[PDB]
Design a protein around this ligand. Structure first.
Ligand SMILES: N[C@@H](Cc1c[nH]c2ccccc12)C(=O)O
Ligand SMILES: N[C@@H](Cc1c[nH]c2ccccc12)C(=O)O
Ligand SMILES: N[C@@H](Cc1c[nH]c2ccccc12)C(=O)O
Ligand SMILES: N[C@@H](Cc1c[nH]c2ccccc12)C(=O)O
Ligand SMILES: N[C@@H](Cc1c[nH]c2ccccc12)C(=O)O
Ligand SMILES: N[C@@H](Cc1c[nH]c2ccccc12)C(=O)O
Ligand SMILES: N[C@@H](Cc1c[nH]c2ccccc12)C(=O)O
Ligand SMILES: N[C@@H](Cc1c[nH]c2ccccc12)C(=O)O
Ligand SMILES: N[C@@H](Cc1c[nH]c2ccccc12)C(=O)O
Ligand SMILES: N[C@@H](Cc1c[nH]c2ccccc12)C(=O)O
Ligand SMILES: N[C@@H](Cc1c[nH]c2ccccc12)C(=O)O
Lengths: 70, 71, 70, 71, 70, 70, 70, 70, 70, 70, 70
RNA sequence: UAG
RNA sequence: UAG
């Protein structure tokens, strides 16, 4: 329960924060839809070993800040 | 019990701080409602592996500060 | 017993520092009332995985300082 | 025995440093009274998961410094 | 679930973030395709011990920032 | 054996460095008397979970420096 | 899975990133060929205890940056 | 064997670095006499949970520097 | 597999990065030859507890940089 | 095998670096004599929990630098 | 395999880096000869708990830099 | 002010 | 001042 997390703020409506499955298989297991201004703070977990961000969003991680673009 | 935590201060009435379930399923298990000025300090836990904030709030984490402005 | 803690100083009478239960359920288990100037230094624990502060207070954590308002 | 600790210096007589019980119950298990100028350095422990300071005091923790104020 | 991760932002359509297999074999097990502006945040894992980036992308890791231009 | 420790230098004779008992009870288990200028460097232990200093002394801990006053 | 990693960006075609075997024996187990601008982010692993770069590349590690010359 | 240590340099003859017993009891188990200029680097251990310095000495610990007087 | 590593860049042909055996015996178990411009990134391992560099090379470690000379 | 170490450079002939026994007893178990300019790099260990330096020497530890005087 | 290490560069021919035995006994187990310009990077290990450097060399450790003299 |  |  003490894994790294990412912070995502939607800069438009309809931002998708997609969790990709951990393991031999890489598939979507959940897409969280964010409207403009909403903030998601999401860890890496047993089930999520990669996170894809689609849409305009501001992203903070341990490694710095970045914006995704639509 | 020594997991990371976030600090959330409501900037308006009716902010929701939503805990999303850890595991194969991603659903809401609790939404804490905050009125303007209230502060919630919340950990990641066995049950919560993601936190969604709806409404205007000031947020502090290990990675910096940010404001939500959804809704 | 080495988990993080938060410091809270009341800036008025009747501040409430509320422990929310750890686990599948999220309810109050204790509400600590602080009068003006009193300081509480409180850990996250087996029983408390979130803390809610109601009333005017100065708060320090590992992530910075912040004030709660009424 | 390597838990965090707090430093408290009394700025008047009759300062109370109160240990609150770890566990499902939250009650006092000890109040250490300090007279002006005395310093207490006290850990979080199996028995103590929150500490309340009543009266005027100067306090140092990992997260900085703060003064409690008395009535 | 607390391994390092990398941050990749596609700078053009068709970027490939390729996971190379951990172990005695070094083959591809997944290629994630990114459209311009999308961000992928990907850990090292049981199954992934090297990552290859094809296409123009901006990359953040623990050791600094870099742009691929393949 | 790697617990935190405090440094105490007596600034007058008869300074008392008091170890308070770990556990459900909080009583004195030892008081070390220090003559002016003597330095004591004392750990937290199985037996000592709080330290009280009585009399004028200069104290260093992980969290900074402070003087006790008599 | 939390071992250190190296970042390598080829500055010309034909760069080789060579994994040398962990253990009593030291031999090549894999050679990854990189075309100009491509980035490889590669861990030390059960199988790889040393990495050789041939050809012109820019390298980032925990200890700073360096360029190989081919 | 990776506990904290202290560094003590005698600034006069007859400095005493005293190890106080770990445990329910607090007594002396060893007093090391140092002559002017001698340096002792001493850890906390299974047997030593507090160190008292008597006489004029310069002391370095993790928490800063200080001098004993006698 | 997360032990320290060293980075070595040959500044001339015929540089030898020599691994010395861990254990009661200290012997050579591998000499890696590096030509000008090549970079070797090498860990301490089960089998290697000391590394010797012969010839002109630039070296980065945790403790700073240094050049060997032929 | 990763406890703290100290660095001792002899500033004159006949410097003694003395390992004092870990445990209930504190006695000398080894005296390493250094000639002027020699460097000894010495860990704390299962056998050595305190180190005494006699004679003129420059000493580095985690806590800073100091010279012993003869 | 993740203990501290030292970096030693010979400043003249005939430098000796001497590993002293871990344990109750302190003897030589190995002397590595370095000629001018050679670099040895050597760990503390099961067999080596102190290192003696004889001859002119430049030394880097976690605690800083120092030069040994013949 | 005990060792 | 031994290895
Ligand atoms: N009972 C919840 C409390 C909680 C912690 N963090 C949260 C964030 C959002 C909502 C609820 C929570 C839990 O242990 O997980
Ligand atoms: N139930 C999901 C929640 C989650 C965490 N991080 C995510 C990133 C994206 C999507 C969902 C998530 C999980 O525990 O893995
Ligand atoms: N008995 C409570 C005491 C406590 C710790 N942190 C708190 C925060 C708020 C309220 C009470 C507490 C517990 O161990 O969990
Ligand atoms: N016997 C108490 C001593 C203590 C430590 N920290 C405290 C804070 C307040 C009051 C008492 C204490 C305990 O071990 O928990
Ligand atoms: N299922 C993959 C997801 C993944 C993580 N990091 C990656 C890097 C590249 C491609 C896929 C991935 C894994 O657990 O390993
Ligand atoms: N025997 C005591 C020694 C001690 C350590 N720290 C102290 C602080 C005050 C008084 C005595 C002590 C113990 O191990 O706990
Ligand atoms: N299958 C290889 C992949 C790899 C990781 N790092 C490398 C460096 C060079 C070459 C291949 C690799 C391994 O797990 O070891
Ligand atoms: N097979 C060797 C590879 C190696 C690692 N570090 C080295 C340094 C020098 C020479 C070889 C190596 C080992 O695992 O130990
Ligand atoms: N034999 C003592 C040596 C020692 C370590 N630190 C000390 C401080 C003071 C006096 C003696 C010591 C012990 O292991 O504990
Ligand atoms: N075989 C020796 C190699 C070695 C490591 N560090 C050294 C320092 C000096 C001499 C030899 C060594 C050992 O494992 O311990
Ligand atoms: N055999 C001794 C070697 C040693 C390490 N550090 C020392 C300091 C002084 C004297 C000898 C030593 C030991 O392992 O403990």
């Amino acid at each position: 329960t003490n894994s790294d997390f990412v912070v995502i703020k939607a800069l438009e409506d309809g931002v998708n924060v997609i969790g990709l499955t951990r393991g031999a298989d890489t598939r979507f297991h959940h897409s969280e839809k964010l409207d403009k201004g909403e903030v998601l703070i999401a860890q890496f977990t047993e089930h999520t070993s990669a996170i894809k961000v689609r849409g305009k969003a501001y992203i903070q991680t341990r490694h710095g800040v970045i914006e995704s673009e639509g």
